[PDB]
Amino acid sequence: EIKELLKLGDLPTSGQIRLYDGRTGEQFERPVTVGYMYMLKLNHLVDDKMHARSTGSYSLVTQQPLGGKAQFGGQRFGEMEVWALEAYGAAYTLQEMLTVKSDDVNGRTKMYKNIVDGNHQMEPGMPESFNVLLKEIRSLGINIELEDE
Amino acid sequence: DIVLNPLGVPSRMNIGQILETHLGMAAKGIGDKINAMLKQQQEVAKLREF
Amino acid sequence: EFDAIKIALASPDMIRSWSFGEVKKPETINYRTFKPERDGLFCARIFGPVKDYECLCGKYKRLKHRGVICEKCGVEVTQTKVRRERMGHIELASPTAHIWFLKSLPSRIGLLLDMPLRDIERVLYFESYVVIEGGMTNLERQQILTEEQYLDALEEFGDEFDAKMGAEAIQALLKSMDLEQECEQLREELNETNSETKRKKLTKRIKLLEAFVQSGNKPEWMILTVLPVLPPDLRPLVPLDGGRFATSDLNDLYRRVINRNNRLKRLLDLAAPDIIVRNEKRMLQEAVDALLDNGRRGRAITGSNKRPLKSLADMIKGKQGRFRQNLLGKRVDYSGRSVITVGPYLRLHQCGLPKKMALELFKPFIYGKLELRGLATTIKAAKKMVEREEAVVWDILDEVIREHPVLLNRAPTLHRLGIQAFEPVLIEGKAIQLHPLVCAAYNADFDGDQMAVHVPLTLEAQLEARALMMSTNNILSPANGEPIIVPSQDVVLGLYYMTRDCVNAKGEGMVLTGPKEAERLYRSGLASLHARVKVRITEYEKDANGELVAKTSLKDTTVGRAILWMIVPKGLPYSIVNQALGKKAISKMLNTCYRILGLKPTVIFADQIMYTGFAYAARSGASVGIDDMVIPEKKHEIISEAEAEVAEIQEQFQSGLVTAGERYNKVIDIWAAANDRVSKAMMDNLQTETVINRDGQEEKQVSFNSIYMMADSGARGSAAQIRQLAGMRGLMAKPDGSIIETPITANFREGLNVLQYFISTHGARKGLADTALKTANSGYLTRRLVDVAQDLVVTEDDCGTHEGIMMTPVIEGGDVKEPLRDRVLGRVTAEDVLKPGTADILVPRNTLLHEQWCDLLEENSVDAVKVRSVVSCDTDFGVCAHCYGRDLARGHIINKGEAIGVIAAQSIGEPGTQLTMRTFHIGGAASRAAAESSIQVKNKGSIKLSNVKSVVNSSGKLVITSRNTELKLIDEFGRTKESYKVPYGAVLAKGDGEQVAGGETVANWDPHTMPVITEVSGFVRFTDMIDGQTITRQTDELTGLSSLVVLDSAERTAGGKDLRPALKIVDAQGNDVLIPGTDMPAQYFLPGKAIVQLEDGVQISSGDTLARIPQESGGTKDITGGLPRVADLFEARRPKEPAILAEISGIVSFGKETKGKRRLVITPVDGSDPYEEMIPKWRQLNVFEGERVERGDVISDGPEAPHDILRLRGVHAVTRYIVNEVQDVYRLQGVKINDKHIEVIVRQMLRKATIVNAGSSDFLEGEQVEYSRVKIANRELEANGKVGATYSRDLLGITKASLATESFISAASFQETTRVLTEAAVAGKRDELRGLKENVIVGRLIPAGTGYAYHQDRMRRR
Amino acid sequence: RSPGVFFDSDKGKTHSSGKVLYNARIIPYRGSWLDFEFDPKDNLFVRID
Amino acid sequence: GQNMRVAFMPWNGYNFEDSILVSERVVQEDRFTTIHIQELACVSRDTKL
Amino acid sequence: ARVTVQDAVEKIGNRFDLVLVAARRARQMQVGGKDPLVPEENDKTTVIALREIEEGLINNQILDVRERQEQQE
RNA sequence: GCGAUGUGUG
DNA sequence: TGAATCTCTTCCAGCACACATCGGGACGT
DNA sequence: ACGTCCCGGAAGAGATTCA
Ligand SMILES: Nc1ccn([C@@H]2O[C@H](COP(=O)(O)OP(=O)(O)OP(=O)(O)O)[C@@H](O)[C@H]2O)c(=O)n1
Ligand SMILES: [Mg+2]
Ligand SMILES: [Zn+2]
Ligand SMILES: [Zn+2]
Fold first, then answer.
1. What is the number of other CB atoms lying within 10 angstroms of the CB of residue C114?
2. Alpha-carbon distance C1135 to C1199, whole Å?
């Protein structure tokens, strides 16, 4: 029935036309399929998906950057990404990725200033959320400490 | 007006969209034939026949 | 700053030293004002100030007053972070049991007092009594006493004889216990007793005690008296929109406990009545239990309406405790995210990145450069400028981008290619552009995926992103060696079209003078892109070092193929393009280019491939159209034959000659066969379709049908999908492991009536459901793997040993699947390989079999190499370099540091997940293949059987009565070419050692029945076969005859459960026919649900199927059934009927028969002969009273247990078992994984060991200690003149070898925290850093790469 | 699920012997459930909620 | 949605995986120019101070 | 200009010692003066470090030597 | 700027 | 009299987004 | 109203089968 309808029109039976390239103006080999397909837009738009964070707020209990776009949050360098970096040899990247870029407060203020002075260098310290883990395990009956060097 | 990608069809086994395309091309062919018969004014007996 | 972390119990003195004041008031704050209540929970004089250096009273608001206190409110004017650091305590009135140590299962308190946890709970919840320091009366010490018994006792015994109830009583028992003698008393009791159970109990109790004494702990510390309250900041009180504070779970729990404490304090100053003080103590106890760990007791409390509020054990445990939520995966600044799109104009080491994301990410660098140039003095001017986006910042931004890598990431990151680096290139728009040769690694189609960018800040980090993580530096997968920058779809189509040849196109057979004017002809349009042509091409070679012979000649080729030769770099030979260049061909093109010219030529050559491929693909314009899907005409015929066969099988099932499962399998198999025939018909029709004239008459060729090319080149899809588009679409699988017995018989080009479509719905919903749920499974798997295979890092350049596992080619029955070259490519030969000209040592015993040596081995036809392997590497704390063999993803040997643990665990667990989330878009098709019912040999050769125990049946053939019988085809040079599995009861055509030729069916059996063939000949009597109880007796209406069906456990009652239905061959005179050479009758046990078709008293010859067993084959064979087998392996679960193995070698004998067991006594030549073992005598032994066994040989059959494999045959045996099994799964699904990774998991599995004779060392005899430790110990003991320490290795599953670890932050991070923390606490287990996950938790370098160099420095300093 | 009675099987998994059980449930539209079930000792045991 | 003249063919890779390629004729004739409407609020509260 | 570090790895066999040596040299350039030993094409300090390595005129040995020399001075 | 539920993405 | 095997109870079940609503009532001044 | 309360898997421990 479609063949019969096309042939009612003045269009080729196969439904494939020869097309000419817009750039070089020379014919295509092997005729291609054209027609009118009914297409739809979808409310997943780039200007509602794109997002970027350099320095914004910080969560309140574990001094880490917030999460989400409404809140001006940064991404979640997650557990399997930590595995990927461990799988590479990269270790300084991971250190700054979960000490300076994220948590340690003295660390990241000093890092921000070192940057705005042109001196790229980190000074780690200790993850504040780890300090919190100590406080909780210590609030239970248990006693976790940090032995002398 | 839009270039899709052939290699997407026989993998994504939805052969339906290709027939949708052909049948749409038929529909628009009839549409342009009417458009010509209507631009060149054609003694509506002709429109009626077509 | 610090080092190893210690953990222990906490004395009340310890807690009082922590706290900075006492909490008394269960009232938080005002929320009319917002000052905090005095000495409540958010107090001020306890937990420091509220505002920076601003006392609460107001008298003091100046930095000058640092350190001083107030005198009116009395709050130390200091920073506010002090509110994060300080802690407070509660003075509980009556002591309180600590719910962890109570209910850790094992109950520390329990097996401390040795008192049943039931009774201890009854005491702790104030509904019983217990005597404490009894006295010289009728009663014991640990005796419990109910209400009534205590009533009666106080009636009779009103003496000093003392019993109490509750936490005070538990504390009294604890404190009045002396361990330093209990240890010796219990050890004496061990020396006394003999029962295994008593031994196990007393040894766990004696371990607890001796460790509890070694640590500086005291049993009266398990019982809280002073509960500490967490700081205020760590439990903040959130304001919602308004002046209202939504509920906070910690503050709720604390408030409850404080109210109970206060009310009970009030009762204990009024001499309150005993029932009320008892009820209130119980309430306080239950409240503290809720606080420590809600829900471990009975009905958990809830606060909002009906959801359990969150306690501290839940702040630590779970998928959302601090471990898996904020100490491993952290949210990160300097990040961003967007949607990806293509942009093929990129060199493959750079990625587009929208202007706005760039300007938002590099803001600090921009500030630096602005106030460095001087365009803005302060920082605020800079902030104004970059916000207003004045036109200087774009030049600034170019200069701060130019050479600065950024990390791109795709969300479900699986393998270490999930994060790569790129240099940025600023773009308009808002989408990250990505080079097309990298979607193969990210698994990123552009149907809407999102990628996240990170910026490396520090200078070392940029150098890492450039020298380890760049895109160019990863053009070989770390799983298999084959490339991972393989061109995917449009380009492979463009090439498969650009390098081919039709018979008579333009410019046929005219000579050309070089690739240049080949291109010039094609462009001017005087010759079709592909018509065969003789051209002078000049190919180079490097036959000597750095040499390049430039030999030139007249190849025969096709115009387009030469145009492609304009690109290929110098070294590669011209026979590399003269084929048609499918996807496999182009991949190995890149692979050879890599191996021969290093890196930079191959990168530039991959760019050239992509460019030219896209170009000539566009020029082709290979569109798909409806007409290009041709329906065959063998389809109708094949389908009609299939329906005739299902009709016949339906008739037979109507005649009852076959059971339900048997008819089901018959139907499904004929449909599979007809499916195969239809597919072959369509595929032939498509491929050779085009018959075109030559200037002769006519000639056929390979078609240019568009869908044929899209399926032949290897761009997308496969024969399965083009099958569903042209032939019938086969069968359909239920969401579980089932196949429907009504196959769709139509293809999409044809319509589908409603019913067929409905069945297709069954199939597709299988697809989706399995993706989701099996995804969950596989993810959990990879987690477990990378948490047992973590603490493993190449550390030495050479261990210096000589153990090595053996390597042979693997064959399945057709083509050799994974040949010796593929298995032993790149691995250090253990022991020099003799040329088979014996004593001509071909390769020395520490060479690295790279590709040249692999070719030598292939030429000289070696089929066994002994090669070094990680499982037997003798280095302490790691693996030496050589024993790990060739690294992958780089050519050269492994380095010193590259953390092979994690890369191995990922490459094993990855394709489980990746295939899972993809298993659907084949459709619902059924990957099912018949058993082939016969072994059709392929090539001239000889025959070799292994493990045959056959017998000659009546008709003169040879049936096989042995289980694992393995057939082999040898060639005419000695080489082993074929191996088959001949199932039980199969019929051999030729015996062993007989020359057969091709196409000579040697074996023939029935693929849906496990027969019960005999070995003797005589009459038959049913033994122990009572109707109704065990067997059932059906009757054929048609033939008037009957038949037996033997039932399993599911129906027999106690009337037959103690019976055994079995056939028994008698002779004509009613006597026991004995199997030749034996003394045991010829009895044959029938398994459950077995069909007996014969009659009684019948005469039968040797080798006749007395009984059939419907085989009950599984449904489908995709990766939704494989992966659980992988879990079973790496868990080391004991299978159902473990084939028992021969423990000690020597001759065998029987013993004294029990009711239903049977002794087996193996006597060696001379040694400790009395070894025995009981065998459940319903298990058919595979050895007879006279013959002899060697340790490791079987006695019965079936599955085979890895524990026993280990303790009998050897580590090499168990590792070869594990690797062959898991490779069987992943190859059946078609997945390349090199073996090193499975071997390193096996290593990390078997790492604990158990002592046998401490000798001169210091190990308890029945102790379990890690193998490396005992090895270094007895190694130095041997270095002195002493005796070693005999040990036996254990094989723990992974999810146990990760818990029983020396560290405990690792364990705590893995899969449960209650158990690990309580145990580590009571032992005081000091933990060093020593590994990767520990150092990551604590947040410092990782002794993996660059960190490994640093830790060299650090361990050197200390 | 419709308020009424249902005679369910729960075959296989339990008891690791293939002995099926047979639990009859009375599911009322508003109130307390009611369940009857056998044991591998062929004993008829009731439970409530 | 709206019906557009499509033609199936590879075209210089700009539709490598699935990436539809759209001619500027479409964006000129405003035949996907959708409209959104956001709702922004602003509350005023009298509190302490 | 720099795309691949393969020559740098060839002259420092580790591919991790590459990161360490290069970073140390780059700090020498960026923080404390010490002009490069190769005509910089406005490539950054990082690429300049890797480039000097490719010229085979920097490695851990030369760095230790020259640091010791200047520190004595 | 917390946690729940929910819908929806790759 | 002790060693199997049947019963019950704890513990885990992939990753990364995006957005929406909604957050406790019950009585003396 | 303000203020002030209320499911596979496994390992422990019955308990039942050998004597
Ligand atoms: N629970 C899920 C669902 C989807 N994905 C991601 O989604 C990808 C599959 O995308 P999808 O579009 O659903 O299937 P594709 O075949 O990749 O593309 P298409 O559906 O268009 O065929 C997977 O690789 C995976 O990365 C995932 O990780 N986890
Ligand atoms: Mg997809
Ligand atoms: Zn004050
Ligand atoms: Zn070694």
1. 12
2. 6
Is C43 annotated among the ligand-binding residues?
no
Instruction: Using the CB atoms, write b or e for C1025-1059: b if 16+ within 10 Å.
Output: beeebbbeeeeeeeeeeebbebbeeebbeeebeee
Terminal-residue alpha carbon distance, chain F: 35
Judging by DSSP bridges, how do beta strands C335-341 and C431-433 pair with one another?
Answer: parallel
CATH number at residue F61: 3.90.940.10
DSSP string covering C571-631, please?
SS-GGGTSS---HHHHHHHHHHHHHHH-SHHHHHHHHHHHHHHHHHHHHH-----GGGS--
Cβ contact C228–A54 (<8 Å):
no
Contact C106, C204 (CB under 8 A): yes
Contacting residues of A for E2, CB less than 8 Å apart? 38-39
C794-796 and C879-880 strand pairing: parallel
| C-beta of residue C217 within 8 angstroms of C-beta of residue C8 | yes
In angstroms, what CA-CA distances link C689 with C493, C701, C1042?
20, 8, 57
Instruction: Return the beta strands (E) in C166-234 as ranges.
Output: 223-229
How many domains are contained in chain F?
1
The Cα–Cα gap between C709 and C831 comes to 49
DSSP E6: E
- Dihedrals phi, psi of C531, to nearest 5 degrees: -135, 135
Asked if C128 and C101 count as a contact pair (C-beta separation under 8 A), the reply is no
Question: What element of type H or E holds C752?
Answer: none
Using an 8 Å Cβ cutoff, are C77 and C59 in contact? no
Name the nt closest to C1128 by C-alpha to C1'.
Answer: I9
Can you count the helices (H) and strands (E) in chain E?
1, 2
SS3 of residue C74 by DSSP: coil
From the CA atom positions of chain B, what is the Rg in Å? 17
CA atom of C1108 to C1′ atom of I1, Å: 87
Assign 3-class secondary structure to A20-83. Answer: ECCCCCCECCCCEEEEEEEECCCCCCHHHHCEEECCCCCCCCCCCCCCCCCCCCCCEECHHHHH
What tokens does C855 get? 């070719």
**What is the sign of the dihedral through the CA atoms of C496, C498, C499 and C504?**
positive
- Rounded distance, CA C1014 to CA C1030, Å? 22
Q: Which residues lie closer than 8 Å to C913 by C-beta, 6 or more apart?
A: C412, C414, C775, C778, C779, C782
Q: Does E27 touch chain B (CB under 8 A)?
A: no
For residues C90 and C226, the answer to whether their CB atoms sit within 8 Å is yes
State how far the Cα of C864 lies from the Cα of D5, in Å rounded to an integer.
67
Residues C1112 and C1120: their CA atoms lie apart, in Å, by: 19
Q: What backbone torsions phi and psi does residue E9 show, to the nearest 5 degrees?
A: -170, 150
Count of residues for chain B? 50
| Strands of C611-709, DSSP E | 691-692, 699-700
Burial of C885 (0-12, 13-18, 19+ CB in 10 A): buried
Rg of chain E taking only CA atoms, in angstroms: 22
User: What letter would DSSP give residue C1099?
Assistant: E
C522 touches chain A (CB under 8 A): no
Residues β-bridged to residue C747: none
- Domain residues for the domain of F66 are 1-73
Name residues 27-46 of chain A within 8 A of E (Cβ).
28, 32-41
Q: Which residue reads 């990250």 in tokens?
A: C432
CB neighbours of residue C1182 within 10 Å:
17
Distance CA A54, CA C459 (A): 18
Tell me which residue of C558, C530, C583, C561 sits closest to C709, measured CA to CA: C583
Q: Which residue carries 């506010």 as its tokens?
A: C80
Length of chain D as a residue count: 49
Q: Which CATH code fits C626-771?
A: 1.10.132.30
Three-class SS of C405-458: CEEEEECCCCCCCCEEEEEEEEECCCEEECCHHHHHHHCCCCCCCEEEEECCCC
